[PDB]
Amino acid sequence: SRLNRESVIDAALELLNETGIDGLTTRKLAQKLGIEQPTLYWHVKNKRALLDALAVEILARHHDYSLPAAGESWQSFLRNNAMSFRRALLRYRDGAKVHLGARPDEKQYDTVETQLRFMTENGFSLRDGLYAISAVSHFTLGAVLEQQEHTNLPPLLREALQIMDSDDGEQAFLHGLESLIRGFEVQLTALLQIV
What does the binding site for ligand MIY look like in residue numbers (CB under 6 A)?
Answer: 59, 63, 66, 81-82, 85, 104, 108, 111-112, 115, 130, 133-134, 136-137, 146, 160-161, 164
Within 8 A by CB and 6+ apart from 8, the residues are 29, 33, 43, 44
d(CA 135, CA 176): 11
Helix (H) or strand (E) holding 16: helix 5-19
Contacts with a second copy, 83-122, as mask; x by CB under 8 A: -----------------xx----x--xx-xx--xx--x--
- Measured distance CA(167)–CA(177) in Å, rounded: 16
Q: Whole-angstrom Cα distance, residue 139 to residue 1?
A: 40
Question: Quick one: 19 or 84, whose CB is closer to Cl ion?
Answer: 19
Residues that bind a second copy (CB under 8 A): 100-101, 106, 109-110, 112-113, 116-117, 120, 126-128, 130-132, 134-135, 137-143, 145-146, 149, 153-157, 159-160, 163-164, 169, 171-172, 175-176, 178-184, 186-187
